Amino acid sequence: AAESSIQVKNKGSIKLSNVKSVVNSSGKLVITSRNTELKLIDEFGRTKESYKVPYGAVLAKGDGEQVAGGETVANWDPHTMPVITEVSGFVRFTDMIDGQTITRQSSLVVLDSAERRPALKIVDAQGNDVAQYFLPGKAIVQLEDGVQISSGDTLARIPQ
């Protein structure tokens, strides 16, 4: 099932447990905890549904909202888990080597461990120091330096 949408059978209010609240670029929140639980409370304590929510997911409706049912309550990438930026501002890229750690597809790969992963924090505005960014194999960041990206946003990670 390539579809990442989660359907709800009945109108039961979602009960998101074991989650971390992180402010995203919009009113929705992104969970940074690998272990998450969902539940349905409609009239009593019994939970109609459970399902599962991976890391980097965005909930369509907030916790405690009585969803009418038959509609998506949380949406996430079914192929990749996005990495949330703790600091909002320009992306600080350190030791950017062109021709070895750059792969044109702007969208450019960060680095390759086999070919060689510098760690740096997101700049506050342009280059201020405020967080460790880890780049595993085949990790790509499409946001160039000075993009001034807000918190809770992520580019395509390109899993290895």
Instruction: Tell me: does residue 9 bind another protein (CB under 8 A).
Output: no
Its sign, for the CA torsion 56, 62, 66, 72, is negative
Query: Minimal distance in Å, beta carbon 134 to another protein?
Result: 6
CB count in 10 Å sphere of residue 104 = 8
Residue pair 5/73 in contact by the 8 Å Cβ criterion: no
Nearer to another protein, 24 or 72 (CB): 24
Q: Which of 8, 16, 19, 32 binds another protein (CB under 8 A)?
A: 32
Instruction: Tell me: does residue 35 bind another protein (CB under 8 A).
Output: yes
- Only one residue has tokens 């960041």, namely 141
DSSP state of 108: E
- Only one residue has tokens 């639980």, namely 37
Query: Minimal distance in Å, beta carbon 73 to another protein?
Result: 24
Stretch that binds another protein, among 31-39, 99-107, 121-129, 149-157 (CB under 8 A): 31-39
Site string for another protein, 83-122 (x = CB under 8 A): x---------------------------------------
Nearer to another protein, 41 or 156 (CB): 156
**d(C-alpha 2, C-alpha 117), whole Å:** 31
CA atoms within a 13 Å half-sphere pointing along the CA-CB vector of 146: 1
Instruction: Tell me: does residue 80 bind another protein (CB under 8 A).
Output: no
Q: Which of 34, 46, 52, 116 binds another protein (CB under 8 A)?
A: 34
Query: Minimal distance in Å, beta carbon 92 to another protein?
Result: 18
Query: Could you tell me whether strands 13-14 and 108-109 are parallel, antiparallel, or unpaired per DSSP bridges?
Result: unpaired
DSSP state of 85: P
Q: Which residues bind another protein (CB under 8 A)?
A: 32-35, 83, 134
